[PDB]
Amino acid sequence: MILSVLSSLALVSGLMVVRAKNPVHSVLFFILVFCDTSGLLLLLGLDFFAMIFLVVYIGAIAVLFLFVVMMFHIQIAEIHEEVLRYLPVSGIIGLIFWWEMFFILDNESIPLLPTQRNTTSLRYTVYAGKVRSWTNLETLGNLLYTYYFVWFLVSSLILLVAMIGAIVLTMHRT
Amino acid sequence: MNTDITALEKAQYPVVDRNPAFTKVVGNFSTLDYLRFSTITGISVTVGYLSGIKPGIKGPSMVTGGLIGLMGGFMYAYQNSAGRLMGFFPNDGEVASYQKR
Amino acid sequence: MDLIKYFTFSMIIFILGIWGILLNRRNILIMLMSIELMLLAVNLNFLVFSVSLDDMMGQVFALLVLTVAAAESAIGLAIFVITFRVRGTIAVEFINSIQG
Amino acid sequence: MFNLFLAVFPEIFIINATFILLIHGVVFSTSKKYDYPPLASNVGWLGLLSVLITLLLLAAGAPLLTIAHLFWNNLFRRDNFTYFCQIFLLLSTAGTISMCFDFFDQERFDAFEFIVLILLSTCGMLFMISAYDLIAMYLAIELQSLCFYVIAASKRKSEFSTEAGLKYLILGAFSSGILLFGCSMIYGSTGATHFDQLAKILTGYEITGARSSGIFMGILFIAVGFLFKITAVPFHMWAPDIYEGSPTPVTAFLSIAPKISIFANILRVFIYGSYGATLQQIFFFCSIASMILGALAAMAQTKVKRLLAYSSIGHVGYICIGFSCGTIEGIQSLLIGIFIYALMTMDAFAIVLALRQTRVKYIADLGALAKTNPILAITFSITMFSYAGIPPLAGFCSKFYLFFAALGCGAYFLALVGVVTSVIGCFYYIRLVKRMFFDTPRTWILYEPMDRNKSLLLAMTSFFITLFLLYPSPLFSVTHQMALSLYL
Amino acid sequence: MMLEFAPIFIYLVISLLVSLILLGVPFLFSRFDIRFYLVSILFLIFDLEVTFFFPWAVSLNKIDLFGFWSMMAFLFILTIGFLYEWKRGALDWE
Amino acid sequence: KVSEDKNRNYAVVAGVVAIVGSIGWYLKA
Amino acid sequence: YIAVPAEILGIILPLLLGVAFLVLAERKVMAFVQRRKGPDVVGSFGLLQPLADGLKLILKEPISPSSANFFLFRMAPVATFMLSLVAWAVVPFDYGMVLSDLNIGLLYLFAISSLGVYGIIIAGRSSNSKYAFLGALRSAAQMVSYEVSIGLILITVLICVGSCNLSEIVMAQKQIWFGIPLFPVLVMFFISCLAETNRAPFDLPEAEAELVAGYNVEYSSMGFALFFLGEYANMILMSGLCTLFFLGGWLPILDLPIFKKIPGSIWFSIKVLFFLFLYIWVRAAFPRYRYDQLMGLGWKVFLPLSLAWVVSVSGLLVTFQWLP
Amino acid sequence: PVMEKLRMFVAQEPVVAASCLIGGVGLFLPAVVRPILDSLEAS
Amino acid sequence: VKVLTYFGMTLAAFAFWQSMDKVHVWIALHQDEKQERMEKEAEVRRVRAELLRKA
Amino acid sequence: LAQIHASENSKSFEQIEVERALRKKYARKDEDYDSMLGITRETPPELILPDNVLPG
DSSP: OHHHHHHHHHHHHHHHHHHOSSHHHHHHHHHHHHHHHHHHHHHTTOHHHHHHIIIIIIIIIHHHHHHHHHHHTOOHHHHOOOOGGGHHHHHHHHHHHHHHHTTTTTTTSOOOOOOSSOTTSSOOOOSGGGSSOOOHHHHHHHHHTTTTHHHHHHHHHHHHHHHHHHHHHHOOOO | OOOOOOOSSOOSSOOSOSSOOHHHHHHTOOHHHHHHHHHHHHHHHHHHHHHHTTTTOHHHHHHHHHHHHHHHHHHHHHHHHHHHHTTSSOOHHHHHHHHOO | OHHHHHHHHHHHHHHHHHHHHHHOTTOHHHHHHHHHHHHHHHHHHHHHHHHHHTOTHHHHHHHHHHHHHHHHHHHHHHHHHHHHHHHSOOOGGGSOOSOO | OGGGGGGGHHHHHHHHHHHHHHHHHHHHHTOTTTTSOOOHHHHHHHHHHHHHHHHHHHHHTTGGGGTTTTTTTTTOOOOHHHHHHHHHHHHHHHHHHHTTHHHHHHTTOOOTHHHHHHHHHHHHHHHHHHOOBHHHHHHHHHHHHHHHHHHHTOSTTOHHHHHHHHHHHHHHHHHHHHHHHHHHHHHHHHSOOBHHHHHHHHTTTSSOSSOOHHHHHHHHHHHHHHHHHTTOTTSOTHHHHHHHHSOHHHHHHHTTHHHHHHHHHHIIIIITSOOOTHHHHHHHHHHHHHHHHHHHHHHHOOBHHHHHHHHHHHHHHHHHHHHHHOSHHHHHHHHHHHHHHHHHHHHHHHHHHHHGGGTOOBGGGGTTHHHHOHHHHHHHHHHHHHHHTOTTSTTHHHHHHHHHHHHHHTOSHHHHHHHHHHHHHHHHHHHHHHHHHTOOOSSOOOOOOOOHHHHHHHHHHHHHHHHGGGSOHHHHHHHHHHHHHHHO | OOGGGHHHHHHHHHHHHHHHHHHHGGGTOOOOOHHHHHHHHHHHHHHHHHHHHHHHHHHHHHHHHHHHHHHHHHHHHHHHHHHHHHHTTTTOOO | OOOOOHHHHHHHHHHHHHHHHHHHHHHTO | OOSHHHHHHHHHHHHHHHHHHHHHHHHHHHHHHTTSOOSOTTTGGGTTHHHHHHHHHHHSOOOOOSOSOHHHHHHHHHHHHHHHHHGGGSOOSBTTBOSOOOTTHHHHHHHHHHHTHHHHHHHHHHTTOHHHHHHHHHHHHHHHHHHHHHHHHHHHHHHHHOSOOHHHHHHTTSSSOTTTTTHHHHHHHHHHHHHHTTOTTSOGGGOTTTTOOOTTTTOOHHHHHHHHHHHHHHHHHHHHHHHHHHSOTTOOSSSSTTGGGSOHHHHHHHHHHHHHHHHHHHHHHOOOOOHHHHHHHIIIIIHHHHHHHHHHHHHHHHHTTOOO | OTTSHHHHHHHHOHHHHHHHHHHHHHHHIIIIIHHHHHHHHHO | OOHHHHHHHHHHHHHHHHHHHHHHHHHHHTHHHHHHHHHHHHHHHHHHHHHHHHO | OHHHHHHHHTOOHHHHHHHHHHHHHTSSOOHHHHHHHTOOOOOOGGGOOOGGGSOO
């Protein structure tokens, strides 16, 4: 039920991202999709990722988009178009993608139907793994910098490329 | 950190030391190793000088080229010495100072 | 039925990105934003799958993908800015000179 | 601990050298004392030196690159195949950089950061070749792509360069998202991302009725990303526009280096892997579509760069035919075709860069070139006849294997398509010879002679093209060696 | 456990109610500056740096010297980038 | 009587070292 | 869960009273510095001045200008006020006195601070005023610029503690308060908080006489009040964070039975009050930087020093094996 | 004569010099002192 | 859009997701029939191959 | 016209070499990278002809 609520909010917010006449409004509805995603992540028990989606996607990336799109002052005439003529092609593509892709896990991951019986007493509890609990933060930090550090450093190289490109493409020194 | 030097392809020459230390590898440098190092450093300094004349920075360009050459030349010499000591390269000299010492 | 619902959440985000590509012929900023939606949907799949399989490899890739998404957004908006500066407008009729 | 890093000496050196060059360029380009000197050529020469030293370090330490393979296993895998692929990539980068100095000086492109981004993309392609996991593969691909997006828009005041950058960014991000989706589907279905784990899980079943639809669609989406990367139809339309709109050295670098890196990735992800002929049918149909579309579109072109772009699309189709057949000789012929196409493309782009000092734009601009520079007109004609596949030139090997695999794998439609496309290609290649030799235009264009770098590279590539078939054994043997290193 | 997040949600609901009450009671009686894009870019880079520091800072006790030096190399690459920013005048608003 | 450009002198020495080192490298390999 | 809203209101309502009286306290302290009295007529010693001002704003007619973004214009003060309020759900006042014992509380606080910029930017664009928009852009850029230094200082404290739990951050200072060995870090943090709150010497929105119009110039009645309450609640929160990270939170100055007698909530309140006094004393002491000058300070001084302190503290701790 | 260039750099850019010294201490301790303590413990 | 339009859209999407839940339950309920059909068709193919391999 | 020709023909070896280098340095331009660097490159006076000999 809660997943239904979050799914509906994300669906409507994403439709608003792709269908808002004003791009600034599209960026603000994108922030709502990211907040909804963060709620989903909190339901998964991954609090670090839920907070990092707020810090990075909303706090940094969406701010970048908002800053740029606001200073553009885009007039509706340059980007407007009637989208009624795209109902059939979008209908076909969306229906094909829907049937093939919303049920891709059904054959591999067959759902457990909820019986009218308390199957929650069949929960076996192991206290050995509960003596010292690791947070999602510590579990990630145990791996990032030692056993998979090459990928970490390559990501740093990617960021350096971003900085250099931003300067070489836009800088006009005074 | 668990480490393992085990290589995929086995050495084809007597293994004098399977994991030689940094100082030991450096102390194992031969005259050929110092020749490779000096050639790479000299070529790099020359390229820095010649490429730096047009912008007017031949001195600093020589320094930059020499830094690149020193790094690459040390790397090449260390590679050769360590590979000799691990038996990946022909190392009759290292085996002489192992049988004798 | 938990896993299928998480997966269909990610699915609708990916589908909305595809639709944003399809529906915005004249709005290339929203084309970029639709691509960002698709990348978020994939990042969520990795996290959901990592939880589902009890395996940490999904989370490592989720962090690294967030880094890639940030860099790609930065450079994309730079290219947007320079295109706008050269033309003075963002309309797609002024970015179609190369053809044939 | 230090000796474990002998497996990554080349990458460590080239990354550190790139950092040194970045600092040098930024410190002295902003200097008032030296009057803010252009440093594109200075940094370019130092970076060519760095690339050559990296090549020496990689080539000489052939066994040492496999050291500590268990420790490095979850990050990359180095073997014979990656060894020779990386050597080829470094040589291609060196030749491309050598062809840039006249462009830096006469155009006055003073940005040294162009060289730094080329070096960083070279590091990315090096990591692509040795990638042995979906995560590493994606990250290296993305580093490469970001560098390319930046350099394609390097002429930031030009309408063409900005347009090419924008189209490149949008379509490349789209395809990268598709590929990442494929990786996520595979991970969710198998619980693995390492190529060995994927090889074990998939082998022996392919489509056995109870087929994992997640693995199928993961393979499909990853293949779509790869086909975008190799400019294969119908994921190709970005390539002609980007090739035309980017600065000509950028176009030269994009037409060679990224193909080697991604074909290495394709061979290690699928051949080393296991699934039904579905993926082979994917590449088969894309090869046929690529040959047809490339031939016709190249026939329609009036500009040199667009013609070369469509020619490259047709030739990747010819190359992917070798991947589809799924034999050791298929992989060998794919490697041979990639090598020969790289050398021929470097020859052609050296000629194009030489003529760009006079702003060559149209095929008609080559009129009376046999009179105003006879040796150059002959060199370009040797390249064009090699492109057309006429023997005894080096370009004939691709045609020969295309027809050989078809009459062996049992294909006859493929043979027909190859015949028709070969004839069309011969027509639009010999049109350039006709323009340089047969036409008598009222107005001529007199071209500035090329610099020493491009002339030396042109002389060497022209000798290779005319004479490779006289002594071709080393290429055949080294490609056969690589093909087997993939499996055993 | 995510149990401590439920009070935060109820807190958000109550804060929204208070804000709506406060804001609803009175109803009864064309210039692009590249430097903002640039500051956004730098903020994005250093925000990702703070992100990668949080797992590292809580995990220093187990990664020991190796993790410390891997982070140091990461910082070194990003600080080379920052020095490039400094020298190119991206940090100067004059 | 004397060449005064010290950077040029250093570069000359570097070229000489490169040449002599190449010769020695060949002779001892 | 039926008792949770009671605790939530027991947090929120006294916070609003505290904000209303922080504005009075700032007016009284600035006045006393200036040889004047400050509010002293509306109520005994001016104690009813906040009630009168709030009631005045409630009765004032809302303008809501003829903009094309009426929903966003009104939602912007609600966003910033809700964000200012929600940070207090994870703040501990004493051992066990905290609404949500978040294990990721430090990163949660960083996320809230990162979110704060949106109210200011949306107010600027939705207000249909070029002057409000350019002011909002400058304020947003300054806030994000000082967020980097705030985050790096948070990482330094995290390395010392090795846990994102605020209560654990306090209880890690039982041996010694972090403000003693990290005094320069505390000074940098207090200045970064000043700049992050748009407070003097960094109060661009108050620089109207400097031809610099604030982001909230087109706001009247309770939208303006919500912006003001958010900023002052953030000032109280920044004082609380300075207290928690560097002054031992609810811990006494010395671990002696004579100090341990008075409750830890009183200790925490005293320290918060001392930092709130500094916010006002600094406002009364100095002039303000230009926008370019404070941006230069943010990127060229506070970021390098914060990064250097992260490196130094982590290196020293791993060297001597003093890590948590 | 690179001994007063450092002096002028410290005079003109005190924040940068302080940052460099602080980070340099932080890097010097584990690179030098930590192996010294490790070697001492083993013996 | 107006606030009420957004909320009506959210209610419509909630109904759509509940319908999706019904669809997933239905697909789960027909696993046995699908496996039985798969087995019968596999047996058909195997019998045909074994009879064709005879010649 | 006599003035410019007399000026050019009487230049010494050192000045001839200085102006050869200047002519090479200012033959082309990259005003875009100059704008990125925040500088404006000006033609030196030794390379500018008097207005009385120009076609305008």
